[PDB]
């Protein structure tokens, strides 16, 4: 049949779309163009089971949604007889947990709305306005909100005006107000031009006889206010008197919705009305403070967070009226056993301290730092952490300081679990106190040492982490003897078998060396570093990073007490770690190798590296190459280039390729520092660019590229022009890695010498008789043009007119 043929062709096309490579583009283009010929019938009849297939993958869903979009755009009024069925098929997608599923549902529905028009959408969706099932009404409300987003809010405004005032049933009014709420939630700040109209349309519902209509009206007001933040308060004038009166009558979840609406309305107001209104609602709020139902308590907590964050509500009012019942009724051990209440109360209390002052809030809870309930201790400690991280410790006096010290000491001592919150809290409080924790530092380090001697290694790891976090303040407090004792105990704990704790211990040792110094360190460096030498072959990345950083700092500021042979051994062990996958270990390795190279002479380590360069001919040769570059960047390059170039005179070729690769990476790595060494390496590059071996030409072109990009804008134009004369003749080379390196060199030279010189090299062969020459030169011209389109205007040659066309750019020939 022709319908069966249509079905088979559509099936083949969809198959080419889902599984094809291109093919997808062509098939997509043809199914939109042939949409009206196929008809909405077979198309949607086959698409809907595929769209709701349980085994479809996400990107396949995106592809099919794009197909739907294209076929919908050309098929406008032909989709109308099937809109209702499309709706019944699609609306479970609008409540799916996947966010992208809901976005694709809204996009499909909006495309459907714009293809079929507002009329058929209202005519289609009206019989379900008063349906008994709540979820069908919820789906229709979301669908109407997306339809409003598609066609514009004013287009759907009269329908809402009619539905929200329907005399026949409260269900229609409920659905219309829910439509308004979903419009707010979906469109955000875009609802602002019609916010007044929506509020005027729904405001009557607040005094309705049905409770659910009042609740959905308050929730819609809250959604409109949240979407309008921080604008549009004037548009709410007409809603102010109902809600404010409603909370003096309603109780329960209705009162909760009304207060939530009020709490979202207050931050939109100016100072005077915010003050007046929050004074008007604080009595009802404080009354609801002791409610047993948890959703009400969460909503009122959110509302107090909102209203205390509004300009106009003075700090003294919050001090005298809000703070005592809040702290008396909310800070109890029952609420700490649920995560949401925990987090919400913490953020609310931090915002309160943000407005009324840090000390005012901190002094009311420090003693609870010594409660036996460990979860309560964790909650109060987290609260103090966030408050003190925002504002500091400048507001805290001596008495509250001692209270804080005693509380954190007790909380840290009576610890049975490896809480990272206790570690971060201790660290940030001590580091925020600064030089003020000086009198309390003996007992504190005693407790750290206590936890450093705990039987379980995770507690030890936490103690070492605390040491690292607090070493700087302990230094500025001048207590170097306890720090030295801590270094001695950690050095005695360096044979620890568990890698993460050992890494934390090494980090603590790095902190202790950074604060005490290398001369007064206990144990001596001459005993410390050989103990660190076998730890470098450990496989865990944390131990590796920490130990490498420690060795690097030792080599940076205390290499006096260590012989050169031990440092060469460290360098030999360190060379292999330059090819690690983790960038932190590579960075630490670079830093540490640089510190060692700076500390010791260049000659011996450079000799070892050149020996390695010649005797490897394998993958770690590039490792050796990186090490040479590190030496050149950290130490001075005039200590490397003489010996490197004298080793180049050996005629074994493979060593020369190694020298060239080393120079390439060296110049790329040192960048701007190479500007004083172009002349020094110019003869070797002259030799290599004219050598018979083509690998030499490719690597030398790489050196030229890295050089030209590194010295860009520092006046090396003549040396690069000279090297350009040796780089250029290789543009006809056939080997891909070679011509690729040549083009890279040409691009670097375009940057460094300028597009005008490169264009001057280009113009003869752009219209050369040979097609191969034209291919090469037009490739180069394309690269120059893409990189330097606007500059070439000044560099094009004078092309004279002929008998047919004008080729002179006369404007540039103007002379005032």
């Amino acid at each position: 049949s022709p319908e069966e043929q249509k079905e088979r062709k559509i099936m083949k096309l969809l198959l080419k779309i889902k599984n094809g490579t291109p093919m997808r583009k062509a098939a997509l283009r043809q199914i939109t163009d042939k949409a009206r010929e196929f008809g909405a019938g077979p198309l949607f009849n086959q698409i809907l089971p595929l769209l709701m297939s349980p085994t479809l993958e996400d990107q396949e869903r995106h592809l099919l949604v794009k197909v739907i979009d294209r076929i919908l755009y050309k098929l406008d009024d032909l989709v109308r007889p099937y809109v209702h069925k499309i709706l019944v098929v699609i609306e479970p997608l609008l409540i799916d947990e996947d966010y992208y599923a809901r976005v694709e549902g809204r996009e499909i529905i909006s495309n459907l709305a714009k293809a079929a028009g507002l009329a058929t959408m209202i005519s289609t969706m009206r019989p379900d306005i008063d349906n008994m099932d709540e979820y069908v009404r919820n789906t229709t409300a979301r669908a109407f909100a997306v339809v409003a987003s598609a066609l514009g809010i004013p287009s759907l405004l009269p329908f809402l005006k009619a539905v929200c005032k329907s005399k026949k049933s409260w269900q229609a009014r409920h659905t219309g107000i829910k439509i308004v709420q979903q419009i707010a939630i979906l469109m955000g700040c875009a609802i602002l031009p019609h916010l007044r109209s929506l509020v005027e349309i729904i405001e009557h519902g607040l005094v309705d006889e049905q409770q659910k209509v009042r609740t959905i009206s308050a929730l819609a007001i809250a959604a409109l206010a949240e979407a309008a933040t921080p604008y549009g308060i004037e548009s709410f004038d007409s809603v102010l008197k109902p809600l404010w009166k409603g909370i003096r009558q309603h109780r329960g979840k209705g009162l909760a919705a009304f207060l939530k609406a009020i709490g979202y309305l207050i931050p939109l107001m100016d100072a005077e009305y915010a003050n007046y209104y929050t004074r008007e609602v604080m009595l009802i709020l404080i009354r609801e403070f002791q409610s047993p139902d948890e959703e009400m308590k969460k909503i009122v907590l959110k509302v107090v967070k909102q209203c205390c964050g509004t300009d106009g509500v003075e700090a003294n009012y919050i001090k005298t009226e809000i703070l005592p019942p809040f702290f008396k009724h909310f800070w109890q051990h029952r609420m700490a056993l649920d995560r949401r209440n925990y987090r919400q109360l913490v953020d609310t209390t931090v915002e309160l301290a943000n407005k009324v002052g840090a000390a005012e809030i901190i002094s009311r809870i420090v003693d609870d730092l010594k409660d036996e309930a460990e979860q309560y201790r964790k909650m109060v400690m987290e609260t103090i952490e966030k408050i003190m991280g925002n504002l500091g410790a400048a507001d805290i006096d001596h008495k509250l300081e001692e209270q804080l010290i005693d509380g954190i000491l007790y909380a840290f001592q009576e610890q049975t679990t490896e809480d990272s919150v206790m570690l971060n809290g201790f660290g940030t409080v001590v580091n925020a106190l600064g030089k003020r924790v000086k009198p309390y530092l003996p007992q504190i380090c005693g407790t750290v040492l206590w936890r450093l001697n705990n039987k379980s290694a995770k507690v030890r790891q936490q103690a070492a982490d605390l040491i690292s976090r607090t070493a700087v303040v302990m230094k500025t407090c001048q207590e170097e003897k306890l720090m030295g004792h801590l270094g001695v105990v950690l050095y005695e704990y360096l044979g620890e078998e568990y890698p993460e704790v050992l890494g934390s211990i090494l980090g603590a040792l790095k902190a202790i060396v950074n604060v005490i110094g290398m001369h007064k360190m206990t144990p001596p460096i001459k005993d410390l570093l050989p103990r660190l030498t076998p730890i470098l072959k450990n496989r865990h990345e944390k131990v590796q990073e920490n130990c490498i950083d420690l060795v690097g700092r030792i080599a940076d500021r205390g290499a006096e007490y260590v012989s050169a042979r031990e440092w060469m051994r460290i360098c030999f062990e360190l060379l292999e770690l330059l090819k690690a996958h983790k960038k932190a270990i590579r960075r630490a390795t670079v830093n540490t190798f640089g510190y060692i190279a700076k500390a010791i002479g260049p000659h011996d380590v450079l000799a070892t590296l050149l020996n390695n360069l010649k005797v490897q001919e394998r993958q770690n040769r590039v490792c050796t190459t990186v090490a040479i570059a590190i030496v050149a960047e950290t130490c001075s390059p005039f200590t490397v280039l003489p010996a490197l170039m004298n080793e180049y005179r050996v005629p074994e070729l493979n060593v020369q390729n190694g020298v060239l690769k080393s120079l390439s990476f060296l110049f790329e790595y040192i960048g701007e520092m190479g500007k004083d060494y172009i002349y020094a390496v110019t003869p070797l590059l002259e030799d290599a660019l004219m050598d018979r071996d083509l690998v030499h030409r490719q690597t030398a072109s790489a050196v030229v590229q890295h050089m030209s990009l590194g010295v860009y804008g520092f006046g090396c134009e003549d040396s690069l022009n000279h090297l350009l004369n040796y780089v250029w003749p290789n543009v006809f080379e056939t080997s891909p890695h070679v011509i690729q390196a040549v083009m890279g060199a040409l691009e670097g030279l375009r940057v460094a010498i300028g597009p005008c010189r490169m264009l001057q090299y280009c113009l003869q062969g752009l219209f050369h008789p040979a097609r191969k020459v034209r291919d090469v030169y037009w490739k180069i011209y394309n690269s120059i043009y893409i990189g330097s389109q606007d500059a070439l205007i000044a560099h094009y040659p004078r092309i004279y007119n002929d008998d047919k066309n004008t080729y002179i750019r006369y404007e540039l020939d103007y002379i005032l």
Binding site: S563, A564, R565, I600, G601, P602, H603, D604, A607
Partner: peptide
């Protein structure tokens, strides 16, 4: 060999780094 003069080379490098700074 080089191992006997390694300490002398390190001392010369330290002297050069002190004189350069």
């Amino acid at each position: 060999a080089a191992a006997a003069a390694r300490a002398a080379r390190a001392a010369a490098w330290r002297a050069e780094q002190a004189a350069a700074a």
